[PDB]
Amino acid sequence: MGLFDRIKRVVSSNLNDLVNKAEDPEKMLEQAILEMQEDLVQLRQGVAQAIAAQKRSEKQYNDAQNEINKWQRNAQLALQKGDENLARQALERKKTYTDTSAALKASLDTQSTQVETLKRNLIQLESKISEAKTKKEMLKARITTAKAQEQLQGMVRGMNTSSAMSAFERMEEKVLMQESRAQALGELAGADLETQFAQLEGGSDVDDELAALKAQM
Amino acid sequence: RSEKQYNDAQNEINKWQRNAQLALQKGDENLARQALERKKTYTDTSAALKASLDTQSTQVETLKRNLIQLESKISEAKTKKEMLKARITTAKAQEQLQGMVRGMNTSS
User: Fold this and answer.
1) Cβ(A30)–Cβ(A80) under 8 Å?
2) Contacts of A79-83 spanning 24+ positions with Cβ under 8 A
3) Is B89 touching A (CB cutoff 8 A)?
4) Which residue in chain B has the smallest CA separation from A144?
5) Is the CB of B70 inside 8 Å of chain A's CB atoms?
6) Could you tell me if A68 and A94 are in contact, meaning their C-beta atoms sit under 8 angstroms apart?
7) 3-class DSSP assignment, residue B65
8) Rounded distance, CA A154 to CA A166, Å?
9) Rounded (5°) CA angle B34-B40-B41
10) Distance from C-alpha of A93 to C-alpha of A100, rounded to nearest angstrom
11) Residues near B17 by Cβ (< 8 Å), separated by ≥ 6?
12) DSSP conformation class of A157
């Protein structure tokens, strides 16, 4: 495979390092979210449509019950004034439409059963996406703090990766060098062994003076 | 704001359980049961949001402590800076007032 698949992998590595390198966490986070809530619209629409279909089937069942009520009332009307034969035919249409209504209600049962599972699933997913959004807000706050920390770090004396503390500490060395260089003039000149002579000869003098003052009490 | 929405959800579930008891008195059993199904749903949602709220607080705590640390650090940096500016003031003086021993006359 080598002669081609390694060409593929290396050119792909160049391109995918370019892509990942051209990626700012903050802006591209900001664009991470807008996309997520795109198939959420179609979900709404589909739930709505299943609802409407299940509702219209129920509506037609209700209308059929109303119409069979009307037709049994017409049957009793015929039973009073109308003929026995026409009344019997009207009691045959009534039973036919009534069995039809019963069958449609039998179907209606499973209709409701399914719309129920369609409504519960929608609730679940709404919850999930809501929690996703809140966690997203927290972890955008995280990167805000990360900006701050990484851009305000390198402040210990043990390191000066920062260009602000770099100047700071090179200047620390600047001032200490200045002080020591100036102080060199002392020991360079010939009066450094005289001052330490005086200090050595007077170290006990101060305590001697304090003792003499105390004894003068 | 996440805490605010959790609090609002608790207030709204309180309102909805009160509406549920209102239905239980005058309202239908079926509507009341549906209102006790929405109540439990929103209540489990509130519980989940509080579970999240716990880690929310945990993180804001570490975010607040870090800020305190860094504020302290920069303050101490400034005070040390003041002292070491005083140092250079004294260095001006000494280097410009030096070369005074009889052994040397680098001074003009």
Assistant:
1) no
2) none
3) no
4) B63
5) yes
6) yes
7) helix
8) 9
9) 90
10) 10
11) B39
12) T
CA angle (A185, A187, A190) in 5-degree steps:
100
Resolution value (Å, 1 decimal): 3.8
Q: Which two tokens stand for residue B47?
A: 């519980």
Whole-number Cα distances in Å, A98 to A62, A65, A78? 12, 8, 18
Query: Per this entry, what is the length of chain B?
Result: 108
Residue to test with chain B: of A138, A169, A194, most B Cβ within 10 A = A138
Which has the closest alpha carbon to A18: A26, A7, A10? Answer: A10
The answer, for B63 touching chain A at a CB cutoff of 8 Å, is yes
- A189 contacts B88? CB cut-off 8 A: no
Question: Across the interface, do B87 and A137 touch by the CB < 8 Å criterion?
Answer: no
Token pair 């927290």: residue: A138
Q: What is the number of residues in chain A?
A: 217
- Residue entry with tokens 């140092």: B87
**How near does any CA of chain B get to the CA of A138, in Å?**
7
Q: Which two tokens stand for residue B89?
A: 């003031």
Rg, chain B, Cα only: 35
Buried b / exposed e over A39-57, threshold 16 CB at 10 Å, is eeeeeeeebeebeeebeee
Name the minimum distance, in Å, from the CA of B19 to any CA of chain A: 21
Residue B52: list chain A partners with CB under 8 A.
131, 134-135
Query: For residues A26 and A147, is the Cβ–Cβ distance under 8 A?
Result: yes
- B5 CA to chain A: closest CA distance, Å? 10
